[PDB]
Amino acid sequence: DNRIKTVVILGGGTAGWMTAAYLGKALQNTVKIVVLEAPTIPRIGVGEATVPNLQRAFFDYLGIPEEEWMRECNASYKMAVKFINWRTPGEGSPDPRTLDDGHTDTFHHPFGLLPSADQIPLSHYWAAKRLQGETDENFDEACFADTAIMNAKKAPRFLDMRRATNYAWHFDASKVAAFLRNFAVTKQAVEHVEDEMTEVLTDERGFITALRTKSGRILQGDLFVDCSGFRGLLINKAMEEPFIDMSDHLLCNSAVATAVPHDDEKNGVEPYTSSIAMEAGWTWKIPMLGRFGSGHVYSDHFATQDEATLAFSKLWGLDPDNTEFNHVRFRVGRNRRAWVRNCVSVGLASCFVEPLESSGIYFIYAAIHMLAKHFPDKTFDKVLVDRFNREIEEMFDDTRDFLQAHYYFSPRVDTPFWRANKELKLADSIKDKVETYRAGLPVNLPVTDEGTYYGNFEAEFRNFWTNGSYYCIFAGLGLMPRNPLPALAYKPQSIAEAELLFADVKRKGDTLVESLPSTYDLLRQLHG
């Protein structure tokens, strides 16, 4: 018996309690699990966004049904991230400005895979038409019915809870952490120790043997999960693993956030996250029932905390001296290695990027999934650790590259921030992908039906940013292929097939924008 007997998880919040819960189920009560978290000085619920795999891959694995957790964390629905004013210059504003060509400066990044005709994705058929003047429709409205639905602020389920489209979740992070702590302690025999860590005890090889708490108590274990946040108390401090700062790729490194009460009966609820462009960065809007979480993400090299706070308060008509603000100064990048010896970093202690494409919780889920799959015995095979490291390296870097694209291919150059983005070098992987897009070829072509994509995580993980996500962002910012896909010139029967799929998206959007309840109405059913 050479197995791990005890796992110690430093830190609660979302990372620690997702880790505790997933491992509880994965390790089938053959391993003792201890969470050590300091006492929680509660901080205002700024809202967090998720991706659609979360219910299948996490809550369903734990047997927690969707309604049960949503009702305990004031959860709303999310059908896309909506980008507002990313192409036009000037101060932030909730309202979209107007382009030269007369279009409103908004584009959606919805969920799901694009349909195909003669194995060519709908993206390419729309591009042909748009380059050739045959259409004035935007990519998002042409190719996703969800675009029509989000414009009408309708819900992604009918009131009897039949599904209409794909969706993910908005919620208060700390309420989810609490729902999960309580799940893990009552139903999974996790030991909750509320205290500070003061010492990390290590052997001759530098493997951790226990953590000392402030009350003097010593927690022995065989594997340690650093969920300590940015401080990286195990992975960076004790293990001495270097962080790789990646501000050479993204410039934002601060936020100022808050909750804003909201007339849900007057305005309706948006079933989506909004990325509202500002002078020195951007601002999230995450609708929940009653309120919305918002935060101005900025660079401190292009705005002071004051400059940012004023601009952010101006946005929403808030009083700066009578408004409760959280001020984060995050690090952007990842550990050289996520897992050193017997210390596995998960969450902010592992890696971070601005929450521009709802990456935070997915990064946590991806790591714990990958920890369960590569779970070690006490010999800590170096290949096991290496492969875990490789999965996290690629997951992170590919998503950094994807985020850089949002900035490098913004046409905005008014403020020194937006111009500064154009002076960064693009990574080789994303240059190669732009070269491909520009010749009209698909990038990251989905090779699987949506059922398998959102059913089997391993399938989604091999192809997280698909063709449709590249087209949503490139075409949304106004980068287009140089020309259509040449094969379309030879395929009039295929062009015609695509015209029926464009029709099918119109029919669905029309039919559903009529029959669906408002987002507000579904929430009011759910939480009452």
Ligand X SMILES: Nc1ncnc2c1ncn2[C@@H]1O[C@H](COP(=O)(O)O)[C@@H](O)[C@H]1O
Catalytic residues: 78
Which residues, in sequence order, are CB contacts of 101 under 8 Å at separation 6+?
A: none
Of 57-65, 343-351, 395-403, 472-480, the segment contacting ligand FAD by CB under 6 A is: 343-351
Query: Is residue 13 a contact point for ligand FAD (CB under 6 A)?
Result: yes
Is the Cβ–Cβ distance between 497 and 137 less than 8 Å? no
Query: Is residue 210 a contact point for ligand FAD (CB under 6 A)?
Result: no
Is the Cβ–Cβ distance between 281 and 299 less than 8 Å? yes
Q: To the nearest whole angstrom, how small is the minimum distance from the Cβ of residue 53 to ligand X?
A: 24
The CA dihedral of 430, 432, 435, 441, to the nearest 10 degrees, is -100
Q: Which does 464 bind (CB under 5 to 8 A by kind): ligand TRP, ligand X, ligand FAD, none?
A: ligand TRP
Q: To the nearest whole angstrom, how small is the minimum distance from the Cβ of residue 214 to ligand X?
A: 8
Give contact residues for its own copies (rule: CB under 8 A): 3-4, 26-28, 30-31, 118-119, 372-377, 381, 383-384, 387, 435-436, 438-439, 441, 445, 447-449, 451-452, 456-459, 461-462, 482-483, 486-487, 489-494
Half-sphere exposure of residue 520, counting CA atoms within 13 Å on the CB side? Answer: 13
Measured from the CB atom, the residue of 15 and 505 that comes closer to ligand FAD is 15
454 is in an annotated binding site: yes
359 is in an annotated binding site: yes
- The CA distance from 75 to 171, in Å, is 5
44 is in an annotated binding site: yes
38 is in an annotated binding site: yes
Residue nearest ligand X, Cβ-based: 229
Q: To the nearest whole angstrom, how small is the minimum distance from the Cβ of residue 13 to ligand X?
A: 5
Which residues, in sequence order, are CB contacts of 404 under 8 Å at separation 6+?
A: 249, 250, 424, 426, 427, 430
464 is in an annotated binding site: yes
Measured from the CB atom, the residue of 264 and 357 that comes closer to ligand TRP is 357
Starting at the earlier edge strand, list the strands of the sheet with 197-202. 197-202, 208-213, 218-220
Burial 280-292 (b: 16+ CB within 10 A, else e): bbbbbbbbbbebb
Structure tokens at 203: 């052997």
Measured from the CB atom, the residue of 384 and 426 that comes closer to its own copies is 384
Burial class for 332, CB neighbours closer than 10 Å (0-12, 13-18, 19+): buried
Q: Which residue has the tokens 């989905």?
A: 446
Give contact residues for ligand X (rule: CB under 6 A): 10-13, 36-38, 196-197, 228-229, 231, 233, 348
Measured from the CB atom, the residue of 314 and 438 that comes closer to its own copies is 438
Q: Which does 88 bind (CB under 5 to 8 A by kind): its own copies, ligand FAD, ligand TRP, none?
A: none
Burial class for 430, CB neighbours closer than 10 Å (0-12, 13-18, 19+): buried
Measured from the CB atom, the residue of 272 and 362 that comes closer to its own copies is 362
Query: Is residue 123 a contact point for ligand FAD (CB under 6 A)?
Result: no
* Residue in 3, 4, 2 with CA at minimum distance from that of residue 222: 4
* Residue in 18, 13, 48 with CA at minimum distance from that of residue 288: 48
324 is in an annotated binding site: no
- The CA distance from 120 to 114, in Å, is 10
Q: Which does 295 bind (CB under 5 to 8 A by kind): ligand X, its own copies, ligand FAD, none?
A: ligand FAD
Q: Which does 364 bind (CB under 5 to 8 A by kind): ligand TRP, ligand FAD, ligand X, none?
A: ligand FAD
272 is in an annotated binding site: no
Query: Is residue 358 a contact point for ligand FAD (CB under 6 A)?
Result: yes
Q: Which residue has the tokens 């047997």?
A: 63
41 is in an annotated binding site: yes
Q: To the nearest whole angstrom, how small is the minimum distance from the Cβ of residue 208 to ligand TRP?
A: 34
Q: To the nearest whole angstrom, how small is the minimum distance from the Cβ of residue 360 to ligand X?
A: 11
Which residues, in sequence order, are CB contacts of 162 under 8 Å at separation 6+?
A: none
Query: Is residue 185 a contact point for ligand FAD (CB under 6 A)?
Result: no
- The CA distance from 422 to 413, in Å, is 9
DSSP 423-455: TSPPPHHHHHHHHHHHTT--SS---S-HHHHHH
The pair phi, psi for residue 273, each rounded to 5°, is -90, 135
The pair phi, psi for residue 261, each rounded to 5°, is -65, 155
Q: To the nearest whole angstrom, how small is the minimum distance from the Cβ of residue 196 to ligand X?
A: 4
Helix (H, G, I), strand (E, B) or coil at 250: coil
Measured from the CB atom, the residue of 309 and 399 that comes closer to ligand TRP is 399
Query: Is residue 217 a contact point for ligand FAD (CB under 6 A)?
Result: no
Restricted to residues 246-285, the positions that interact with ligand FAD (CB under 6 A) are 255
Residue numbers in the known binding site for chloride are: 359-360
Residue numbers in the known binding site are: 12, 14-15, 38, 41, 44, 46, 49, 110, 197, 348, 359-361, 453-454, 460, 464
| Interacting residues toward ligand FAD by CB under 6 A | 11-16, 36-38, 41, 43-44, 46-50, 173, 196-197, 227-229, 231, 233, 255, 295, 328, 330, 347-349, 355, 358, 360-361, 364
